[PDB]
Ligand binder design. Structure first.
Ligand code: HEM
Ligand SMILES: [Mg+2]
Length: 217
């Protein structure tokens, strides 16, 4: 829960999502990142972040498509790392698969580029959109195998909306820069800096409206 945290050990699976990695480190998800079921996913997202259980189920249904095992009713966090299923190029904190065949390890050089677009202590929708676009332009210019499919692009917009929605204020569309940086660089919730679990339930409609604002910006 909120009061426990420890880093992954050998055998603990981690993937390309900073938030799922964080929730496993806290034990909201199994700390070993394995055998994650619909019920575990829905309960972890609701307990930790106040994600609507309907949204949590939809996200699980995406996640489970990455498990290579036939007829799987679970996923492990490293299944999410399979290139161009849910994972995609032009991430904010991971390298493109092309360069070193590692699209899952946190990459400080990549993240430093993203952070350079967060110029003020509060991130707004415009700065969030700039950071993501800069990553797309950089991958496009440097990765000869760069692809951002229609679905990958929709995912990319949704991921930027997600850190605003889970950590910040969905009406103003703002979030403290330090909390987002803390999440990515520590894979721990920024509780000591004052972050509180969202008091309003986070539903599909909330994610949709914020995603569309990032697109419009
Ligand atoms: C079951 C639920 C979830 C699943 C299956 C999932 C899956 C993923 C995957 C596969 C990626 C990699 C995409 C890429 O290539 O960049 C990713 C990235 C990301 N996810 Fe999650 N995610 C979930 C929940 C969340 C939540 C609740 C948040 C709230 C903060 C979140 C925030 C992010 C962010 C900000 C990224 C971008 C990472 C980057 O660009 O480096 N995710 N997620
Ligand atoms: Mg990626």
């Amino acid at each position: 829960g909120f009061d426990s945290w420890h880093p992954p050990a050998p055998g603990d699976r981690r993937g390309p999502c900073p938030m799922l990695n964080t929730l496993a480190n806290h034990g909201f998800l199994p700390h070993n990142g394995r055998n994650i079921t619909k019920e575990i996913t829905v309960n972890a997202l609701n307990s930790a972040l106040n994600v609507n259980k309907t949204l949590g189920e939809l996200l699980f249904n995406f996640a489970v498509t990455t498990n290579p095992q036939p007829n799987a009713t679970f996923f492990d966090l490293d299944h999410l790392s399979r290139h161009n299923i849910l994972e995609h190029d032009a991430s904010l904190s991971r390298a493109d698969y092309y360069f070193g065949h590692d699209d899952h390890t946190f990459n400080q050089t990549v993240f430093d580029q993203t952070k350079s677009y967060w110029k003020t202590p509060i991130i707004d929708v415009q700065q969030a959109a700039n950071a993501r676009l800069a990553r797309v332009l950089t991958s496009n210019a440097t990765n000869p195998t760069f692809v951002l499919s229609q679905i990958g692009e929709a995912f990319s917009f949704g991921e930027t909306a997600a850190y605003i929605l889970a950590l910040g204020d969905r009406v103003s569309g703002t979030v403290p820069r330090q909390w987002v940086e803390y999440l990515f660089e520590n894979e721990r919730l920024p509780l000591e800096l004052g972050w509180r679990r969202a008091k309003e339930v986070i539903s599909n409609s909330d994610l949709d409206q914020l995603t569309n604002r990032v697109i419009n910006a």
